[PDB]
Design a protein around this ligand. Structure first.
Ligand SMILES: CO[C@H]1/C=C/O[C@@]2(C)Oc3c(C)c(O)c4c(c3C2=O)C(=O)C=C(NC(=O)/C(C)=C\C=C/[C@H](C)[C@H](O)[C@@H](C)[C@@H](O)[C@@H](C)[C@H](OC(C)=O)[C@@H]1C)C4=O
Length: 275
């Protein structure tokens, strides 16, 4: 059974999620849209994991649909960078508000709150994006905005080679509850091994508490044989998400060095100083 203090942890996390996750993206406004050396080969490969079409459903009932251009060894590959930067900044703001609401997070020193956010901002955004991912149609449904994957060789199987895309399909197949999602966000946020963290011992003790609560939650509410080892499956996904976060950070900094795109908030989260 869940202890009274374990139920207390879930309530505060669910409360922080309810207050800071705009599930309909109704406040995502004024975003940019596409127009009406060996570094580039890596940059061409880094961005070629896009292949995503975009749909705006109008409030009046109209629909705008965008189909991306093909790779032509030119500049067209940067067409969605400004829009993805605005979407990321919107989600990053939501992640920062989520952590600030949590009491266990607000009680840490300011220097460590910054270090934990800089290290987990991407991972918490991926976990929130998974809850709006439609694995049947390969589409992230962000309210009036939709991001649909376009067919690109070997159907969905040659697309699952992309680690970020494989993560979303595998995490969605576990059919997690809202409480399990917010506990994964807490475990990833309170990672003591993030660079720059001073209170390692405290953040580690908090992370173990969040993992124990998630473990106990699964034992009490999922007795089916399909959910055997579900806690261990979840922790394996969080380990893979940390690896994807490291791969993604390097691809981000390589593109920024060739073609600037990062908003001021992203520059702050990835260490760019402006000089
Ligand atoms: C911080 O990352 C952001 C900014 C990157 O800047 C740039 C410059 O560097 C990137 C790196 C390193 C990448 O590998 C990729 C992109 C970009 C950038 O444009 C990209 O444009 C599209 C990719 N692929 C896709 O189209 C896929 C597979 C799915 C399409 C739609 C989904 C709805 C999204 O994937 C979201 C689930 C989310 O992942 C995405 C909004 C993400 O924002 C966040 C907060 O995670 C940004 C990519 C991709 O592979």
């Amino acid at each position: 059974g869940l202890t009274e203090e374990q139920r207390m942890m879930i309530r505060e996390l669910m409360d922080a999620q309810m207050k800071t996750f705009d599930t309909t993206f109704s406040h995502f406004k004024n975003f940019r849209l596409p127009g009406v050396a060996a570094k580039w080969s890596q940059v061409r490969k880094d961005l070629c994991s896009l292949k995503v079409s975009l749909q705006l459903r109008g409030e009046d009932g109209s629909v705008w649909n965008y189909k991306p251009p093909a790779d032509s060894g030119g500049k067209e590959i940067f067409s969605l960078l400004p829009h993805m930067a605005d979407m990321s900044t919107y989600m990053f703001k939501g992640i920062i508000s989520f952590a600030k609401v949590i009491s266990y997070f607000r009680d840490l020193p300011i220097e460590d709150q910054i270090s934990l956010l800089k290290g987990a901002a991407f991972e918490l955004c991926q976990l929130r994006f998974n809850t709006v991912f439609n694995a049947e149609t390969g589409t992230w449904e962000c309210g009036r905005l939709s991001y649909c994957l376009e067919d690109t060789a070997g159907g969905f199987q040659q697309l699952l080679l992309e680690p970020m895309l494989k993560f979303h399909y595998m995490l969605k197949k576990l059919q997690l509850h809202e409480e399990e999602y917010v506990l994964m966000q807490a475990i990833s946020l309170f990672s003591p091994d993030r660079p720059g963290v001073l209170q390692h011992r405290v953040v580690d003790q908090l992370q173990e508490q969040f993992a124990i609560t998630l473990k106990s939650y699964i034992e009490c509410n999922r007795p089916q044989p399909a959910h055997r080892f579900l806690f261990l499956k979840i922790m394996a996904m969080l380990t893979e998400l940390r690896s994807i976060n490291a791969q993604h950070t390097q691809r981000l900094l390589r593109i920024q060095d060739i073609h600037p795109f990062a908003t001021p908030l992203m520059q702050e989260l990835f260490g760019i100083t402006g000089s």
